[PDB]
UniProtKB/Swiss-Prot annotation, chains A, B:
This is Cytochrome c'. PROSITE patterns: CYTCII (PS51009). The keyword Cytoplasm does not apply. The gene is cycP. GO terms for molecular function: electron transfer activity; heme binding; iron ion binding. One of its GO terms (cellular component) is periplasmic space. It comes from Cereibacter sphaeroides (strain ATCC 17023 / DSM 158 / JCM 6121 / CCUG 31486 / LMG 2827 / NBRC 12203 / NCIMB 8253 / ATH 2.4.1.).
């Protein structure tokens, strides 16, 4: 598709991830009361998102070196193996997030912490900083 | 969280739907060669998107009457029954595209036609003509 379109989709993808992770983080932090049903609901939605195959999102020539409006580093394409590894770590942390969701604030907080680490670890090597 | 993030995720969700439907429509139009594997791949991602529960995308007070940058009509919330109806029509049509996607160009075109009808049916009633 056109580069602009791929970029819009890629950012949209992370917008959804952020939308569903947001209330889990809020609850882990104590900003928002713990609600096990709400927690499980967001958690399961996040699992669906990780099931989606994001290949089309990473069309060659759509890095920050190529088009504006994106924060995806060229590194993503030069290190396909490091990228799938950070993706896999995320997918696994999210899987663990499900059972934890309904077992208490302290457990959800622990699980959320692991997921959060995966967000950052990816950003660190593959997202431009500003 | 705030309207602006709900708005970006909703638009993001449709950007992904469009990204995956795009190659299916081009193949059906004869604008790109029929490739059964690729068709199957895009179809299956579309199925995964229809599984994502979109409830959080439709937070009250996020229609075009409320915030700028959205094309979602207040009608979505006024006619929740009819909206759900349009959504299911889309869900079902997408479910029928999967097996057809790799059965041939004519089969794929017919099925993509059905899906296409659902996109526009929902847009006619619930999306601002912008
Ligand atoms: C790598 C495999 C990543 C994982 C795991 C996470 N994110 Fe990330 N993200 C990644 C990239 C390459 C980008 C840039 C996208 C672009 O093209 O610019 C992002 C971006 C985001 C953003 C910004 C979205 C926007 O509107 O522009 C958010 C809010 C975001 N990411 C959040 C996020 C969270 C909450 C994660 C864990 C639950 C997470 N990401 C993981 C790469 C990767
Ligand atoms: C209702 C049940 C819909 C279905 C079925 C389809 N779409 Fe739609 N779409 C709908 C709404 C309410 C909106 C507005 C969202 C907003 O908040 O503005 C949209 C928007 C789009 C867009 C624009 C996305 C953007 O970046 O702003 C596209 C490209 C789009 N929709 C495509 C699309 C396709 C290809 C569909 C069928 C396969 C389809 N949509 C179905 C509502 C509904």
């Amino acid at each position: 598709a056109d580069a602009e379109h791929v970029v819009e989709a890629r950012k949209g993808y992370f917008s959804l991830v952020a939308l569903e992770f947001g209330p889990l983080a809020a609850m882990a932090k104590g900003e928002m009361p713990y609600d096990a049903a709400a927690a499980k609901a967001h958690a399961s939605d996040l699992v669906t998102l990780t099931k989606y195959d994001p290949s089309d999102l990473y069309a060659p020539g759509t890095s920050a070196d190529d088009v504006k409006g994106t924060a995806a580093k060229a590194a993503i394409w030069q290190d396909a193996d490091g990228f799938q590894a950070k993706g896999m770590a995320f997918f696994e942390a999210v899987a663990a997030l499900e059972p934890a969701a309904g077992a208490g604030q302290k457990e959800l907080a622990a699980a959320v912490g692991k997921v959060g680490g995966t967000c950052k670890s990816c950003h660190d090597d593959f997202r431009v900083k500003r």
